[PDB]
Symmetry: D2
């Protein structure tokens, strides 16, 4: 069915409300035109991010009451460890408080200064941890991924030709690892095919190169494979997920996404020495290998949530609800990234605001504008997020200048999607009303989080 | 909006199975085609009743952690007490575990054997307690309420002329009280007007007669007054609620309906001496005046929920959600009781299954078909629920042969309403295929709960 | 060991505090010298009752998050039903919101007007439901049970000679049933031996008389059997519990005691017809046979709690903590009921206040006095509770005029017990300071709950 | 009181197994006689650490249901913010997932390579982050702190003469900051006086040097000031806390200690520019300025818990409970570090097991014996935790060969303290029977976590 109903009931609710346009206007100014700086109670439907904003189930809340809070040997850790071993198939697990905790560990463990890390497009925290540790990032995604309007399947795939080139021009020993993300967040939540995962494994293995996945949205990815990759139609999400990771040497994971929790993450690997070193390091930044900066109750919620994510009807509905928002927007002629990805609809800021150049930050501006007319919060995913080149000092110039309508799992309904789509269509009517922005405060890294702007 | 979006978002979800049609058919058979005998774990959308099946808020769940479990003098009781005094404007309140507990107390307190209790139709528990305490029931609802097709506003209103007639024929002193229900469940959830409540108060007061309300769905009732009664456009739900009860000497309430909880109710009154007698009685059946057979956490959740029920956007959506399901069914020509009430849609199974005789249990069979085709549980409200005649062994044969689609508050979405509507509308496009049922097991009493059937 | 440590850890806490003596004095006056009328937040350690005041475990709180709130077919009901079948061994179960709900059902089901019900001492609600339904109560406990200071084992036992006499003088057909309580609350929480249960079964069976247990404190009872009855020392609590009920035709149960919950109860029986009739009746007073006036989450907590009660270390500690309070009091010469029972220490009001007669209510007075000097709340269990004879109109005159220090399960520590014992010993120092009381308001039944007094 | 009763009662309990000695011996062996390798489910009383193992209140659990899970601008953050501003009096606050996260930020913000950080002894994570950022550590604690038997008040005080010496020898500009810990964990949980904090503030301020506090057990510290520092008799815990931090430029805190939570911490500072830099850094390691790697519910629980920690009766009992265990051990002649600290009792295993050499791991073996005999887990803080020398392969051989009995807040009773004390005192009456241990598995790093032993 095109748009299935929620494969669950509502157990408990929280109120939503909208403050007037004029109140929202004061608010957008006081946040320095950065949606990141608005306050939760001032937001009606909050599509800033699907990170940590998911609704847990009654089963997970039951596990929340059974937190075994021991510093060492918590039953919750054993339950997480066993679940991840079973479902992802890696030998070892190190819990971390969230994803960038596990990225800090991997980057410190796996990178020698001056080595290359090659990935299917960059992510902000991931790239920063690679570069802080002295790696050079190389984008090996296909060119097509960078074209917003181009509707092709598995836009997340690595270009094997580009991978071959890197191996030829630099030498295998100078490549720390391949970073393969599932889905690809900045491409619009685009999936990677199993075929691509296999071919990447085969080539890297022949040269002795390691492959570490970013598992953050691996279930959404597995959904796309089931739906769209020939041969996978009668496979279960869990089977698909276990095969995906069989082509990897380990993974980083933010549980705050596809594990259906509000906090939590982990690092997995197969290598014993790397496991031993990872435990030496987790102690510095996170906590004991037996809790990694998480309460026992959160290891428990995350163990239960990751297994709930395997239910076909859950993930089908998750992905199709996002698709519904995109379909409504597209039917009205609103320009979006296509095809719609697993977790968000990305409005194409370049087309929405054809009158601005990327230098007056159309994407930051539109996000503000949607808040002002709508009370819906959305996120900048363009030139601001891309940050500065640390060799030249200029803005990285992404081809994708996008505004992200990001959907938390199990929180909103199709009627909420309708409210969002209506507000956005009206704003489209007068797209030309959206003004250029300029920096008034710029952080030294990850600048999009707390940067502040003024109109040009 | 004809249909506003949910004025809340989802905090937590309730896991459901999603079993396919073929398994649902096995479950229905194991249940002897009686939806009352289905296991909850086997049902996707459970529309058996809106009683005690509501989703609580995060604030209510917070209060669930603050239960003061004292047997006497719990802080949660004082919170419940002042909330009800504030919102309903009654002087005194006695908590009960649910509605029929309050009804038990009222009927023992307020009836002398042989006296009459007149009301706008009746509900089974309410009327049961009236009769077992010696009252004669007299229906004083307007005749229009008995016409299930008549699309008229405030169909729950008492006919003042019938009340006048009762006064003149039996004498004021032989009338124990008037029992005014808001809304009227038996008529399909039909609201009573403020004008009618005032007229009833004025006539009864001149004769010294008491009026007690069944407040169970008073908040749905208040929404209808707000939406449709000239002059109440500028009034809040709370103002309407407080005015409604100013025309009463007291009430009984099942909190499991409009107080947005899973258990709880209470008895209110203004008379000091009745309050005293009520407290003497509550200890025999329920508990102390300050717990009434409720945990402290539940008095707290009900205090919080009743106040949440006053929010305009909440009750508006609650009622418009039910209306959406009714509207969609009606647009497809599916026969329903009209107008659609505050809490449920009733299918006219006599008309739906015209090819079957009432002796083939059309409503019981339609309810079975609906579950098989959709995973939706509904309640038979026809000849089966009517029971078998005490003395002759004939069926009691009611005019209403209906299936009730009863909607718990804040549990389902419009997409779930589409599951229900689409399934029923498909069944209706080939209704003649629906098969008659026969008893294979019939208990001597409460046959609707445990009887088993097979297809003719 | 004499005084074992708690066989659990503290998971969560609530603050306790004490308001000054003068504030307590105003308070005791405004409650009309009835501890029942004080407010929970004005009480420092609340020993009014062990009914519904117990601390639940983390496992039960986990079940509280998994309430299946369906009106029919709740998984929680199936879990309760199965647990009670397994542990108590009765065929059928009907949930009720609490104990007196199940007593209302049994008394209506099993008593013909003018029949006798014979019991091992009376309880207030139990006796009232017997008499409301037209039974005459006969006390068949041994004489020894009525002597407070007499330290003998299994003071709860029925006098078989007294039972034989009743059978001889009235005829078996005029005895509705034998009511056998475990433990015996008003005797001081006194256990009944297995031998006595067997002999009672054997004699009643030969005459065709039914035996229904009051199961409210059956686990405490089972503890005493394990500890003190020869042959039972190597049996498990669960084994002992299952044998106890094998000598009964059914039971009433307040779950609010030994099932470790804050609300809940049930009625059990073996007879099919009586089960069928009980379901007809529960619908009138409580709710459906599938929930009996309980939320699904409470059926779940009660199923889990009853099974936790079977843990030997739990019940051993439960009973020995009470014994510790009694041992400290006795070592200081404070007069108590002996031996100390399962749930409470009962101060002997007659000996504490030798200067008053029972007619100036020493027990009500002392309870007030302990509150005033201590902030510890305790309960009257003497002449006030015993009520009036409904043939003569005079006070029932119990030989046991007692003040109950009642211990909620898993809430307090030995240090709390020490605070209680110290305060009470000091009050003993000046026992003569405690004044006579007289009624100023007397309820028509169960008068102790909300009766109000003034000093003579 | 020498030992007050608990100023709370139990709301809920945590289930524990209660396995007998013979099974405990098997568990210890399966754990290779290393208590760090025990499963939590196998332990009765877990005194491994007071970090993150505290029992929350009912109010905290209520706040756990009110988590506003927004990625930015959560209401729970603003609550945490204003609570810390109010209670600590720092201008700015950045949340972190726990203490070492705050330490990571501080040391990156406040240290230039080659600079000195001087402090009253150190803690391992704290000093680690100082060194890895280029600092040289200098101990400026009073010499008395190094004498574990010396029974002296405020043993945590900095020696102003050592600080003066450092200033004159290295120059103020080469001192990054002074790190003042309250209490001092390494000295046995020894408190610092207000006089010392003021003297340190005055000297450092004259030279332009910053002072940052490790606030982890500041509330235990404040209790000692209240109890023992002349002039603080009339001051509340809150007044003492606020005055303490007025002598600092900021702090790092592990909320998992004195904020009564299971996870959480924060970084405070007064300097506007450092606050700005801190927010730029927090996003790399932890999360947004308004969540810092914490769920919203946890910022809420920590806001509520920190305020609960200010209650006099609570902290008084917390500290006197630890003191009770120390007093009892000392009265029996069991050798301990003196005076007993705010959070733990340390057994002198060198003296306890005089018959063993440090090479036979007396503390590791005593910790094993304690578990076997009582079901109590303790932490080795001796030669094993000291590690093996980087370059020579010799053991690092510490002066302190101790077993730490670390007490989580609000989890245990005096009866549990008796289990611990009685078990240790019995072991001590035949200490010579305690056997030396030898390595059977030794990892290359963090050997205390995973090493395995057998008896010599
Ligand atoms: C594919 C991947 C992610 O999407 C991701 C996080 N995602 C966020 C939160 C956030 C992160 C970076 C931003 O520029 C951003 F604006 C928002 C998000 O909204 O998308 C992390 C890191 O996981 P942590 O957030 O648990 O540390 C690793 N890998
Ligand atoms: C207007 C009114 C009610 O609707 C009502 C209950 N209503 C139910 C539950 C129900 C009750 C009895 C049945 O045979 C039945 F088949 C359905 C329902 O589905 O509609 C009560 C009684 O409130 P209690 O249920 O809290 O005691 C009082 N007044
Ligand atoms: C052996 C037995 C009980 O002890 C009992 C209750 N006990 C109470 C509460 C209460 C009851 C009667 C009083 O006079 C009294 F002052 C207090 C108590 O404190 O002891 C019930 C009834 O169970 P319900 O309370 O769940 O309905 C049945 N049987
Ligand atoms: C005075 C201070 C602490 O005591 C402390 C922690 N303390 C622990 C846990 C622990 C930590 C590391 C170990 O190798 C260890 F064996 C024990 C403890 O048991 O005492 C931290 C760090 O706070 P985080 O743990 O929230 O990051 C900062 N400052
Ligand atoms: K923890
Ligand atoms: K209670
Ligand atoms: K319910
Ligand atoms: K979150």
């Amino acid at each position: 069915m095109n748009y299935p109903a929620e494969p669950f009931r509502i157990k408990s609710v929280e109120t939503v409300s909208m403050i007037p346009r004029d109140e929202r206007l004061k608010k957008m100014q006081e946040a320095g035109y950065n949606t990141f700086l608005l306050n939760s109670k001032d937001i009606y439907i909050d599509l800033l991010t699907d990170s940590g904003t998911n609704a847990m189930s009654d089963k997970q809340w039951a596990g929340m009451m059974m937190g075994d809070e021991a510093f060492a040997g918590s039953e919750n850790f054993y339950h997480l460890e066993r679940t991840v071993q079973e479902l992802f198939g890696f030998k070892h697990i190190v819990p971390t408080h969230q994803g960038r905790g596990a990225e800090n560990l991997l980057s410190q463990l796996a990178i020698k200064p001056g080595q290359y890390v090659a990935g299917n497009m960059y992510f902000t925290t991931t790239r920063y941890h690679q570069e802080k540790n002295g790696a050079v990032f190389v984008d090996i995604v296909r060119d097509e991924a960078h074209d917003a309007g181009l509707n092709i399947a598995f836009k997340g795939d690595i270009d094997l030709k580009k991978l071959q080139k890197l191996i030829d021009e630099k030498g295998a020993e100078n490549i720390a690892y391949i970073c393969l993300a599932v889905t690809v967040n900045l491409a619009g939540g685009q999936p990677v095919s199993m075929a691509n995962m296999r071919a990447v494994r085969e080539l890297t293995e022949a040269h002795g190169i390691k492959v570490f996945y970013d598992a953050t949205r691996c279930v959404e990815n597995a959904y796309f494979i089931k739906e769209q990759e020939q041969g996978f139609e009668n496979k279960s999400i869990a089977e698909i997920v276990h095969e995906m990771f069989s082509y990897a040497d380990g993974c980083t994971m933010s549980g705050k996404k596809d594990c259906l929790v509000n906090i939590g993450g982990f690092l997995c690997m197969n290598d014993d020495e790397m496991f031993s070193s990872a435990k030496e390091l987790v102690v510095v930044y996170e906590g004991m290998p037996s809790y990694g900066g998480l309460a026992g109750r959160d290891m428990e919620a995350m163990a239960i949530g990751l297994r709930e994510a395997m239910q076909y009807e859950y993930i089908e509905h998750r992905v199709k609800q996002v698709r519904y928002l995109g379909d409504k927007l597209k039917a009205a002629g609103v320009p979006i990234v296509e095809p719609v990805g697993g977790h968000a609809v990305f409005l194409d800021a370049r087309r929405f605001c054809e009158h601005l150049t990327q230098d007056e930050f159309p994407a930051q501006s539109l996000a503000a504008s949607i808040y002002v007319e709508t009370g819906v919060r959305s996120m900048e995913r363009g030139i601001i997020s891309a940050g500065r080149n640390n060799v030249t000092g200029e803005h990285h110039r992404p081809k994708l200048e996008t505004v992200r309508l990001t959907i938390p799992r199990r929180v909103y309904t199709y009627a909420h999607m309708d409210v969002v789509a209506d507000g956005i269509i009206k704003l489209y009517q007068h797209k030309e009303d959206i003004r250029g922005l300029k920096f008034i405060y710029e952080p030294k890294q990850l600048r999009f989080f707390t940067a502040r702007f003024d109109y040009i």
